Design a protein around this ligand. Sequence first.
Ligand code: ZN
Lengths: 120, 50, 60, 154, 102, 51, 62
Amino acid sequence: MKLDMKQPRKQRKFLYNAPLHLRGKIMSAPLSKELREKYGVRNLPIRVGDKVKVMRGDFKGVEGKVVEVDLRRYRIHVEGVTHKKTDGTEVFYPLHPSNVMIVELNLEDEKREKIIERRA
Amino acid sequence: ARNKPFAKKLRLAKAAKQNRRVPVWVIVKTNRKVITHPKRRHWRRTKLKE
Amino acid sequence: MKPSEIREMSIEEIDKKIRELRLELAKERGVLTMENPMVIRNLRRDIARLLTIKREKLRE
Amino acid sequence: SRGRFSYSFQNFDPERMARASGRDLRISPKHSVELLREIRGMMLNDALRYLDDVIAKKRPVPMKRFNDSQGHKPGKGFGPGRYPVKVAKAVKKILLNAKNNAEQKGLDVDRLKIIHAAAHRGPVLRGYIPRAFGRATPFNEQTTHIEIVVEEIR
Amino acid sequence: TAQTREIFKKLGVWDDIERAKKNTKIRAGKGKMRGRRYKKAKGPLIVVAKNEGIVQGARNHPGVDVVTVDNLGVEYLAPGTHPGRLTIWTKGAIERLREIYG
Amino acid sequence: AGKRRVTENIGKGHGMARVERIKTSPRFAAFVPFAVGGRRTHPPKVEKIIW
Amino acid sequence: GAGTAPKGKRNRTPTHIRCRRCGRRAFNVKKGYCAACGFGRSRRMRKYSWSHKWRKKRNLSY
RNA sequence: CUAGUACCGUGAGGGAAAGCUGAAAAGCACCCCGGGAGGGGGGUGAAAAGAGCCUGAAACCAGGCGGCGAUAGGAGGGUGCG
RNA sequence: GCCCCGGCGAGGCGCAGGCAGCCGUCGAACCGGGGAUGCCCGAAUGGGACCUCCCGCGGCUUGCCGCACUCCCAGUCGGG
Ligand SMILES: [Zn+2]
């Protein structure tokens, strides 16, 4: 996307009001060195059925599958990243994808294959 | 009995439908940020324009 | 209930389907006063589809 | 649970003391002040007797700070006096709350003693009364907070 | 840029470039809302006769300015009204000075 | 800016100062440079020469 | 006198009702024209330069 | 910020106020009292920051602590001491 | 909110942190472009408006088209 404006008000306005077909791109994450060597790609937009490793925060070092992606709030849900409630129900802790790394992809649609073919 | 023009009757019906409070699920969904709207009106305090 | 199917049909069938759908809508709105709260929405949009495509045909 | 106010009392020992509060009450803070000045430093049961008597209008409460146009009463030591019934009732409710809290903490009611009793002014509820010559003047309610601390004499 | 890096290491101005990098701060005040954050320090100034790539090569070094002789001003030579800036000259630039004298 | 309100002054003999005031419900002072929401006495101007 | 008591004789027919073109209650019912838009008196809109009403309605500077 | 909005005037017209929990709702499980607003115990959180929510000044009110205090005369202070 | 051509590539159902449920891999939501539907008043125009609502005349086949004022070209058809 085209972003050439040195005014923070305009940058943050774009970010807060960006249309949906760009939030997936804004929600990208990097690959592990193995996948990087294999496919020739440094980062990809994230998807639900992906295997994921946490690199920053309290749950540093945990691995899990992605189960939910919210484009409005710019967040994702990971299995195993949870806290308990006053009563005792478990609930997910919402994470940013810039704080996480991909270790196994979900390759069942042809369009992701095309994204890789494109940026490699 | 009491004689009304029809368009006037319809405008009055609209003004009556307008006069109720914000529902409860809107308050739940907004986290107590929307509680009122500016068209509450009591028949004996603020008059319509007929 | 999609244009794929709708455009395979003739006009009389389309009008008949519109008719039955409108009666369904009236009955469902009647019961709604006293599950699946999207029946009304989907019925409305099906009616819209049918009218759009029938007009495409009768115009060409 | 879910309390949003603190106390003016310092050095609270959870082992020998219990607390109680009343918040946002539609009563007179002046009369609250006058009344609490009397039960300060007393035993809980003696204070409950005092309040019963006040309510039944057999014991008057002296007025030493808020006494404009107030008549005297029969008995030694009385200039201005009064009978605040609403305030008595509310204070009685709070005192029973405190007695319960001590009983459940594990103290002994026979030796409970009031060591802190203070009234505070709460938030005002604005109102208006129509006057003559096209005016409208305030007609407001002043609310009251009351705090109480009980200790066990050993 | 890497060749410029090596040349500056051999000449002895890489340490002033490092000072420029290190002495760069986030401002105090409301200029941060209006952009204008990151008050940046000044490094060396390269005066050249003709540009044939050195502008691109040296641009991205923090504090480094590149200018030709025909387009010199006093803000390149005395930032903040304080004169005595570290300057790298060229032979052609000095000959053009011999010609124009200013 | 500051010169959008319509005002009327009360004058001598109201136990009040001679300030220009709005003529509906609140009746707040307006348009003067010591009033809240009024015009500024000596604002910056683009005519000014900086060169 | 002239104050509170004459205010009781405001139960007659109103001087203005709603206008079909403008929307507001300024249509003079006995003369047959609107005092805000000119309906019944002119095809064109009432629009004076000394007025602030239309500028306010469009959020314009004076 | 649900602003030319609410509201005022028969009308021409006049015209407000109102921003901020927390990294994450983890937005308070369970117990005693109370007709109930709610209070007291217990819990979440790095921190109650508790939705009457960032920080939280002064005026003003109450309580506690210290000094004085019912034979006594000046715009409430100044100098010197106890 | 309905349809079609392209883009993007899995989620989506406005401000708006809820419940119950639906749409989408036959490529959605979203974005660029092009179409359909588009109640009443209003220049308001078949005729009337003290209440954004009422009352008609022709022609065709219950549904459709025409029917204001001031003019031009014409001419008892029409086109502007
Ligand atoms: Zn009008």
